PDB file of N, CA and C in Angstrom:
ATOM      1  N   UNK A 148       0.829  -1.200   0.000  1.00  0.00           N
ATOM      2  CA  UNK A 148       0.000   0.000   0.000  1.00  0.00           C
ATOM      3  C   UNK A 148       0.865   1.252   0.000  1.00  0.00           C
ATOM      4  N   UNK A 149       1.942   1.245   0.781  1.00  0.00           N
ATOM      5  CA  UNK A 149       2.852   2.381   0.825  1.00  0.00           C
ATOM      6  C   UNK A 149       4.185   1.941   1.413  1.00  0.00           C
ATOM      7  N   UNK A 150       5.238   2.668   1.035  1.00  0.00           N
ATOM      8  CA  UNK A 150       6.572   2.454   1.595  1.00  0.00           C
ATOM      9  C   UNK A 150       7.213   3.831   1.741  1.00  0.00           C
ATOM     10  N   UNK A 151       7.146   4.388   2.951  1.00  0.00           N
ATOM     11  CA  UNK A 151       7.580   5.766   3.163  1.00  0.00           C
ATOM     12  C   UNK A 151       9.057   5.936   2.829  1.00  0.00           C
ATOM     13  N   UNK A 152       9.928   5.279   3.592  1.00  0.00           N
ATOM     14  CA  UNK A 152      11.367   5.401   3.395  1.00  0.00           C
ATOM     15  C   UNK A 152      12.024   4.074   3.738  1.00  0.00           C
ATOM     16  N   UNK A 153      13.042   3.708   2.965  1.00  0.00           N
ATOM     17  CA  UNK A 153      13.745   2.446   3.153  1.00  0.00           C
ATOM     18  C   UNK A 153      15.117   2.717   3.757  1.00  0.00           C
ATOM     19  N   UNK A 154      15.318   2.269   4.997  1.00  0.00           N
ATOM     20  CA  UNK A 154      16.611   2.454   5.645  1.00  0.00           C
ATOM     21  C   UNK A 154      17.710   1.718   4.891  1.00  0.00           C
ATOM     22  N   UNK A 155      17.433   0.491   4.456  1.00  0.00           N
ATOM     23  CA  UNK A 155      18.382  -0.315   3.703  1.00  0.00           C
ATOM     24  C   UNK A 155      17.818  -0.590   2.319  1.00  0.00           C
ATOM     25  N   UNK A 156      18.595  -0.252   1.294  1.00  0.00           N
ATOM     26  CA  UNK A 156      18.262  -0.520  -0.097  1.00  0.00           C
ATOM     27  C   UNK A 156      19.409  -1.295  -0.726  1.00  0.00           C
ATOM     28  N   UNK A 157      19.089  -2.379  -1.429  1.00  0.00           N
ATOM     29  CA  UNK A 157      20.122  -3.214  -2.019  1.00  0.00           C
ATOM     30  C   UNK A 157      19.635  -3.752  -3.354  1.00  0.00           C
ATOM     31  N   UNK A 158      20.492  -3.652  -4.365  1.00  0.00           N
ATOM     32  CA  UNK A 158      20.210  -4.156  -5.702  1.00  0.00           C
ATOM     33  C   UNK A 158      21.390  -5.006  -6.145  1.00  0.00           C
ATOM     34  N   UNK A 159      21.100  -6.169  -6.716  1.00  0.00           N
ATOM     35  CA  UNK A 159      22.167  -7.079  -7.119  1.00  0.00           C
ATOM     36  C   UNK A 159      21.636  -8.018  -8.198  1.00  0.00           C
ATOM     37  N   UNK A 160      22.362  -9.104  -8.446  1.00  0.00           N
ATOM     38  CA  UNK A 160      21.883 -10.130  -9.353  1.00  0.00           C
ATOM     39  C   UNK A 160      20.720 -10.890  -8.716  1.00  0.00           C
ATOM     40  N   UNK A 161      19.828 -11.455  -9.524  1.00  0.00           N
ATOM     41  CA  UNK A 161      18.645 -12.112  -8.962  1.00  0.00           C
ATOM     42  C   UNK A 161      19.011 -13.382  -8.211  1.00  0.00           C
ATOM     43  N   UNK A 162      18.159 -13.748  -7.251  1.00  0.00           N
ATOM     44  CA  UNK A 162      18.319 -15.014  -6.543  1.00  0.00           C
ATOM     45  C   UNK A 162      17.742 -16.142  -7.385  1.00  0.00           C
ATOM     46  N   UNK A 163      18.155 -16.220  -8.646  1.00  0.00           N
ATOM     47  CA  UNK A 163      17.611 -17.184  -9.589  1.00  0.00           C
ATOM     48  C   UNK A 163      18.751 -17.718 -10.440  1.00  0.00           C
ATOM     49  N   UNK A 164      18.811 -19.038 -10.589  1.00  0.00           N
ATOM     50  CA  UNK A 164      19.881 -19.689 -11.334  1.00  0.00           C
ATOM     51  C   UNK A 164      19.369 -20.428 -12.559  1.00  0.00           C
ATOM     52  N   UNK A 165      18.305 -21.211 -12.416  1.00  0.00           N
ATOM     53  CA  UNK A 165      17.745 -22.000 -13.507  1.00  0.00           C
ATOM     54  C   UNK A 165      16.231 -21.855 -13.547  1.00  0.00           C
ATOM     55  N   UNK A 166      15.748 -20.617 -13.458  1.00  0.00           N
ATOM     56  CA  UNK A 166      14.314 -20.353 -13.452  1.00  0.00           C
ATOM     57  C   UNK A 166      13.701 -20.343 -14.846  1.00  0.00           C
ATOM     58  N   UNK A 167      14.510 -20.440 -15.899  1.00  0.00           N
ATOM     59  CA  UNK A 167      14.019 -20.403 -17.269  1.00  0.00           C
ATOM     60  C   UNK A 167      14.721 -21.467 -18.098  1.00  0.00           C
ATOM     61  N   UNK A 168      13.977 -22.075 -19.020  1.00  0.00           N
ATOM     62  CA  UNK A 168      14.544 -23.030 -19.949  1.00  0.00           C
ATOM     63  C   UNK A 168      14.778 -24.415 -19.396  1.00  0.00           C
ATOM     64  N   UNK A 169      14.224 -24.738 -18.229  1.00  0.00           N
ATOM     65  CA  UNK A 169      14.433 -26.060 -17.653  1.00  0.00           C
ATOM     66  C   UNK A 169      13.818 -27.131 -18.544  1.00  0.00           C
ATOM     67  N   UNK A 170      14.557 -28.221 -18.736  1.00  0.00           N
ATOM     68  CA  UNK A 170      14.074 -29.321 -19.555  1.00  0.00           C
ATOM     69  C   UNK A 170      12.979 -30.093 -18.823  1.00  0.00           C
ATOM     70  N   UNK A 171      12.125 -30.754 -19.607  1.00  0.00           N
ATOM     71  CA  UNK A 171      11.008 -31.487 -19.040  1.00  0.00           C
ATOM     72  C   UNK A 171      11.391 -32.811 -18.412  1.00  0.00           C
ATOM     73  N   UNK A 172      12.609 -33.294 -18.665  1.00  0.00           N
ATOM     74  CA  UNK A 172      13.039 -34.556 -18.072  1.00  0.00           C
ATOM     75  C   UNK A 172      13.098 -34.460 -16.553  1.00  0.00           C
ATOM     76  N   UNK A 173      13.605 -33.345 -16.034  1.00  0.00           N
ATOM     77  CA  UNK A 173      13.745 -33.127 -14.603  1.00  0.00           C
ATOM     78  C   UNK A 173      13.035 -31.840 -14.211  1.00  0.00           C
ATOM     79  N   UNK A 174      12.652 -31.757 -12.941  1.00  0.00           N
ATOM     80  CA  UNK A 174      11.905 -30.627 -12.414  1.00  0.00           C
ATOM     81  C   UNK A 174      12.694 -29.948 -11.303  1.00  0.00           C
ATOM     82  N   UNK A 175      12.401 -28.667 -11.098  1.00  0.00           N
ATOM     83  CA  UNK A 175      13.097 -27.895 -10.080  1.00  0.00           C
ATOM     84  C   UNK A 175      12.807 -28.455  -8.695  1.00  0.00           C
ATOM     85  N   UNK A 176      13.804 -28.374  -7.819  1.00  0.00           N
ATOM     86  CA  UNK A 176      13.681 -28.745  -6.414  1.00  0.00           C
ATOM     87  C   UNK A 176      14.314 -27.673  -5.541  1.00  0.00           C
ATOM     88  N   UNK A 177      13.958 -26.420  -5.800  1.00  0.00           N
ATOM     89  CA  UNK A 177      14.624 -25.308  -5.142  1.00  0.00           C
ATOM     90  C   UNK A 177      14.369 -25.329  -3.639  1.00  0.00           C
ATOM     91  N   UNK A 178      15.423 -25.041  -2.875  1.00  0.00           N
ATOM     92  CA  UNK A 178      15.354 -24.939  -1.424  1.00  0.00           C
ATOM     93  C   UNK A 178      15.848 -23.570  -0.981  1.00  0.00           C
ATOM     94  N   UNK A 179      15.431 -23.188   0.222  1.00  0.00           N
ATOM     95  CA  UNK A 179      15.920 -21.989   0.881  1.00  0.00           C
ATOM     96  C   UNK A 179      15.855 -22.203   2.381  1.00  0.00           C
ATOM     97  N   UNK A 180      16.805 -21.609   3.090  1.00  0.00           N
ATOM     98  CA  UNK A 180      16.781 -21.540   4.542  1.00  0.00           C
ATOM     99  C   UNK A 180      16.913 -20.074   4.916  1.00  0.00           C
ATOM    100  N   UNK A 181      15.835 -19.489   5.423  1.00  0.00           N
ATOM    101  CA  UNK A 181      15.828 -18.098   5.851  1.00  0.00           C
ATOM    102  C   UNK A 181      15.900 -18.070   7.369  1.00  0.00           C
ATOM    103  N   UNK A 182      16.911 -17.389   7.901  1.00  0.00           N
ATOM    104  CA  UNK A 182      17.037 -17.222   9.342  1.00  0.00           C
ATOM    105  C   UNK A 182      17.436 -15.788   9.651  1.00  0.00           C
ATOM    106  N   UNK A 183      17.166 -15.366  10.886  1.00  0.00           N
ATOM    107  CA  UNK A 183      17.459 -14.006  11.347  1.00  0.00           C
ATOM    108  C   UNK A 183      18.142 -14.106  12.706  1.00  0.00           C
ATOM    109  N   UNK A 184      19.474 -14.091  12.702  1.00  0.00           N
ATOM    110  CA  UNK A 184      20.270 -14.299  13.906  1.00  0.00           C
ATOM    111  C   UNK A 184      21.331 -13.213  14.003  1.00  0.00           C
ATOM    112  N   UNK A 185      21.481 -12.645  15.201  1.00  0.00           N
ATOM    113  CA  UNK A 185      22.501 -11.633  15.479  1.00  0.00           C
ATOM    114  C   UNK A 185      22.307 -10.383  14.628  1.00  0.00           C
ATOM    115  N   UNK A 186      21.060 -10.067  14.290  1.00  0.00           N
ATOM    116  CA  UNK A 186      20.790  -8.948  13.416  1.00  0.00           C
ATOM    117  C   UNK A 186      21.110  -9.201  11.963  1.00  0.00           C
ATOM    118  N   UNK A 187      21.464 -10.431  11.605  1.00  0.00           N
ATOM    119  CA  UNK A 187      21.801 -10.800  10.237  1.00  0.00           C
ATOM    120  C   UNK A 187      20.724 -11.724   9.690  1.00  0.00           C
ATOM    121  N   UNK A 188      20.143 -11.338   8.561  1.00  0.00           N
ATOM    122  CA  UNK A 188      19.240 -12.191   7.809  1.00  0.00           C
ATOM    123  C   UNK A 188      20.076 -12.993   6.821  1.00  0.00           C
ATOM    124  N   UNK A 189      19.998 -14.315   6.922  1.00  0.00           N
ATOM    125  CA  UNK A 189      20.804 -15.220   6.121  1.00  0.00           C
ATOM    126  C   UNK A 189      19.901 -16.113   5.282  1.00  0.00           C
ATOM    127  N   UNK A 190      20.283 -16.272   4.017  1.00  0.00           N
ATOM    128  CA  UNK A 190      19.516 -17.004   3.018  1.00  0.00           C
ATOM    129  C   UNK A 190      20.440 -18.075   2.459  1.00  0.00           C
ATOM    130  N   UNK A 191      20.394 -19.271   3.031  1.00  0.00           N
ATOM    131  CA  UNK A 191      21.198 -20.385   2.537  1.00  0.00           C
ATOM    132  C   UNK A 191      20.383 -21.132   1.491  1.00  0.00           C
ATOM    133  N   UNK A 192      20.793 -21.032   0.231  1.00  0.00           N
ATOM    134  CA  UNK A 192      20.017 -21.545  -0.885  1.00  0.00           C
ATOM    135  C   UNK A 192      20.824 -22.558  -1.682  1.00  0.00           C
ATOM    136  N   UNK A 193      20.120 -23.531  -2.253  1.00  0.00           N
ATOM    137  CA  UNK A 193      20.715 -24.519  -3.137  1.00  0.00           C
ATOM    138  C   UNK A 193      19.672 -24.955  -4.150  1.00  0.00           C
ATOM    139  N   UNK A 194      20.123 -25.265  -5.361  1.00  0.00           N
ATOM    140  CA  UNK A 194      19.258 -25.733  -6.432  1.00  0.00           C
ATOM    141  C   UNK A 194      19.752 -27.094  -6.894  1.00  0.00           C
ATOM    142  N   UNK A 195      18.844 -28.059  -6.962  1.00  0.00           N
ATOM    143  CA  UNK A 195      19.227 -29.413  -7.338  1.00  0.00           C
ATOM    144  C   UNK A 195      18.183 -30.030  -8.263  1.00  0.00           C
ATOM    145  N   UNK A 196      18.485 -30.202  -9.551  1.00  0.00           N
ATOM    146  CA  UNK A 196      17.521 -30.844 -10.452  1.00  0.00           C
ATOM    147  C   UNK A 196      17.500 -32.351 -10.241  1.00  0.00           C
TER     148      UNK A 196
ATOM    149  N   UNK B 447      14.912  -5.761  27.068  1.00  0.00           N
ATOM    150  CA  UNK B 447      14.789  -5.569  25.628  1.00  0.00           C
ATOM    151  C   UNK B 447      16.156  -5.558  24.952  1.00  0.00           C
ATOM    152  N   UNK B 448      17.218  -5.648  25.749  1.00  0.00           N
ATOM    153  CA  UNK B 448      18.564  -5.571  25.200  1.00  0.00           C
ATOM    154  C   UNK B 448      18.808  -6.724  24.237  1.00  0.00           C
ATOM    155  N   UNK B 449      19.380  -6.405  23.083  1.00  0.00           N
ATOM    156  CA  UNK B 449      19.752  -7.395  22.087  1.00  0.00           C
ATOM    157  C   UNK B 449      21.052  -6.947  21.442  1.00  0.00           C
ATOM    158  N   UNK B 450      21.766  -7.853  20.770  1.00  0.00           N
ATOM    159  CA  UNK B 450      22.941  -7.426  20.001  1.00  0.00           C
ATOM    160  C   UNK B 450      22.597  -6.271  19.077  1.00  0.00           C
ATOM    161  N   UNK B 451      23.145  -5.092  19.362  1.00  0.00           N
ATOM    162  CA  UNK B 451      22.795  -3.873  18.641  1.00  0.00           C
ATOM    163  C   UNK B 451      21.277  -3.714  18.580  1.00  0.00           C
ATOM    164  N   UNK B 452      20.680  -3.571  19.764  1.00  0.00           N
ATOM    165  CA  UNK B 452      19.231  -3.493  19.898  1.00  0.00           C
ATOM    166  C   UNK B 452      18.646  -2.461  18.945  1.00  0.00           C
ATOM    167  N   UNK B 453      17.827  -2.920  18.002  1.00  0.00           N
ATOM    168  CA  UNK B 453      17.171  -2.042  17.036  1.00  0.00           C
ATOM    169  C   UNK B 453      15.846  -1.596  17.639  1.00  0.00           C
ATOM    170  N   UNK B 454      15.828  -0.391  18.208  1.00  0.00           N
ATOM    171  CA  UNK B 454      14.630   0.150  18.849  1.00  0.00           C
ATOM    172  C   UNK B 454      13.646   0.555  17.756  1.00  0.00           C
ATOM    173  N   UNK B 455      12.965  -0.445  17.208  1.00  0.00           N
ATOM    174  CA  UNK B 455      12.026  -0.224  16.118  1.00  0.00           C
ATOM    175  C   UNK B 455      10.908   0.689  16.602  1.00  0.00           C
ATOM    176  N   UNK B 476       8.775  -2.353  29.579  1.00  0.00           N
ATOM    177  CA  UNK B 476       9.275  -1.207  30.330  1.00  0.00           C
ATOM    178  C   UNK B 476      10.146  -0.327  29.445  1.00  0.00           C
ATOM    179  N   UNK B 477       9.603   0.819  29.038  1.00  0.00           N
ATOM    180  CA  UNK B 477      10.305   1.730  28.135  1.00  0.00           C
ATOM    181  C   UNK B 477       9.909   3.158  28.473  1.00  0.00           C
ATOM    182  N   UNK B 478      10.545   3.760  29.477  1.00  0.00           N
ATOM    183  CA  UNK B 478      10.268   5.167  29.779  1.00  0.00           C
ATOM    184  C   UNK B 478      10.800   6.086  28.691  1.00  0.00           C
ATOM    185  N   UNK B 479      10.147   7.239  28.548  1.00  0.00           N
ATOM    186  CA  UNK B 479      10.520   8.239  27.555  1.00  0.00           C
ATOM    187  C   UNK B 479      10.772   9.568  28.248  1.00  0.00           C
ATOM    188  N   UNK B 480      11.940  10.152  27.993  1.00  0.00           N
ATOM    189  CA  UNK B 480      12.303  11.451  28.544  1.00  0.00           C
ATOM    190  C   UNK B 480      13.308  12.102  27.604  1.00  0.00           C
ATOM    191  N   UNK B 481      13.485  13.411  27.770  1.00  0.00           N
ATOM    192  CA  UNK B 481      14.362  14.197  26.913  1.00  0.00           C
ATOM    193  C   UNK B 481      15.362  14.968  27.759  1.00  0.00           C
ATOM    194  N   UNK B 482      16.573  15.126  27.229  1.00  0.00           N
ATOM    195  CA  UNK B 482      17.609  15.895  27.906  1.00  0.00           C
ATOM    196  C   UNK B 482      17.568  17.347  27.447  1.00  0.00           C
ATOM    197  N   UNK B 483      17.544  18.265  28.409  1.00  0.00           N
ATOM    198  CA  UNK B 483      17.589  19.682  28.107  1.00  0.00           C
ATOM    199  C   UNK B 483      18.993  20.249  28.152  1.00  0.00           C
ATOM    200  N   UNK B 484      19.878  19.741  27.297  1.00  0.00           N
ATOM    201  CA  UNK B 484      21.257  20.214  27.286  1.00  0.00           C
ATOM    202  C   UNK B 484      21.296  21.712  27.012  1.00  0.00           C
ATOM    203  N   UNK B 485      22.077  22.432  27.811  1.00  0.00           N
ATOM    204  CA  UNK B 485      22.272  23.863  27.642  1.00  0.00           C
ATOM    205  C   UNK B 485      23.748  24.184  27.812  1.00  0.00           C
ATOM    206  N   UNK B 486      24.232  25.255  27.178  1.00  0.00           N
ATOM    207  CA  UNK B 486      25.647  25.622  27.346  1.00  0.00           C
ATOM    208  C   UNK B 486      26.011  25.997  28.771  1.00  0.00           C
ATOM    209  N   UNK B 487      25.032  26.361  29.601  1.00  0.00           N
ATOM    210  CA  UNK B 487      25.332  26.746  30.976  1.00  0.00           C
ATOM    211  C   UNK B 487      25.942  25.586  31.752  1.00  0.00           C
ATOM    212  N   UNK B 488      25.452  24.370  31.518  1.00  0.00           N
ATOM    213  CA  UNK B 488      25.960  23.208  32.236  1.00  0.00           C
ATOM    214  C   UNK B 488      27.458  23.054  32.007  1.00  0.00           C
ATOM    215  N   UNK B 489      28.191  22.799  33.087  1.00  0.00           N
ATOM    216  CA  UNK B 489      29.625  22.591  33.009  1.00  0.00           C
ATOM    217  C   UNK B 489      30.049  21.298  33.674  1.00  0.00           C
ATOM    218  N   UNK B 490      29.101  20.374  33.822  1.00  0.00           N
ATOM    219  CA  UNK B 490      29.341  19.095  34.478  1.00  0.00           C
ATOM    220  C   UNK B 490      28.745  17.990  33.616  1.00  0.00           C
TER     221      UNK B 490
END
């Protein structure tokens, strides 16, 4: 609805590795681990067809 | 409420009236 001001702004490469063109033989099995510890948000990700 | 680098997103509120007269 609204976003007044963003204290932290970050732009980078997408969190996407094989989101397009995947063959029909195998299907995506994307995983993520989101945690918030010590003031750090951590995203441990792996992709395995 | 203390946390590692507590992000202040029992909590009394008060303001300091700092003035140049103070010498302590």
